[PDB]
């Protein structure tokens, strides 16, 4: 009469928040010192060290979470970003020339999300609830990884039900660990699965940190049909504020509820 459930009690948590549903994540940002090569290697740190840090700031409601972030090139001609594979030389930038400049030192911008802050060098962790449309396995990616990321899913992984504005949890049981090696960069397109049965929120939080010059992290899903969803997760993504008096509002096993 009944479906068995996964096995071991081993269905993703997941929520259903019964507050005011708000589209996108939240996106808050702490410091991370220039050219510190060796904080963002830390599972605790990128679990939830980061938020011991100053926190700078934050933006809400944010859909179109792919981090593609260049260093000024100071040219002949002004200053324009400088994609990556278009540096070259001690440095110049296809199509300007020289740069003047150092790819060494700190860089204002409003590049992240339209916060003003140093895209160069800072941590961010995006919150909010990931609703699948289709009940499946969703695989999510990062193409790269320039400097650090982890992605988590799950209630108990990403963050509590109904709390999604709390402190970090300490978990480490990322969904993609995408952590800075210690000896030296990691492969691309690298991927974690998620079962999701359809029209429960779960809780997703991704954490990256930047040290120094050019910053990336291309973020995707494929979904159950096979189509993937690339930068912009509008229709996919949510916040509500926290509510943690709302008694019913985990769900931890949904194959059965
Ligand atoms: O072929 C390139 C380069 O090779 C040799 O130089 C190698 C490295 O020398 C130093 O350690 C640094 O200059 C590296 O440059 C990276 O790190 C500095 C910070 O120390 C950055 O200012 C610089 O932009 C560059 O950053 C890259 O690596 C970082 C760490 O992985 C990333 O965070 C960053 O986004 C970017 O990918 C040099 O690479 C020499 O032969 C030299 O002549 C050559 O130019
Ligand atoms: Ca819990
Ligand atoms: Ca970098
Ligand atoms: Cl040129
Ligand atoms: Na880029
Ligand atoms: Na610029």
Known sequence: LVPRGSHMSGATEAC????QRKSGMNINFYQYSLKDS???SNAAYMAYGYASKTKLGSVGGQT???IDYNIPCVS?????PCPQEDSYGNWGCKGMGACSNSQGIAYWSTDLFGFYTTPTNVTLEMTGYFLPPQ???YTFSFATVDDSAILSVGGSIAFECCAQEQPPITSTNFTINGIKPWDGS???NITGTVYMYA???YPLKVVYSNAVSWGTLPISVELPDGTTVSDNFEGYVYSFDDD???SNCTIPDPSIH
């Open 16 to 19: 259903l928040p019964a507050g």
């Open 38 to 40: 060796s904080t963002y």
């Open 64 to 66: 179109d979470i792919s």
């Open 76 to 80: 002949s001609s002004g200053t324009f």
């Open 135 to 137: 009940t499946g396995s």
């Open 186 to 188: 990691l492969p691309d």
């Open 199 to 201: 029209g429960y929120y």
């Open 244 to 246: 943690l008096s709302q």
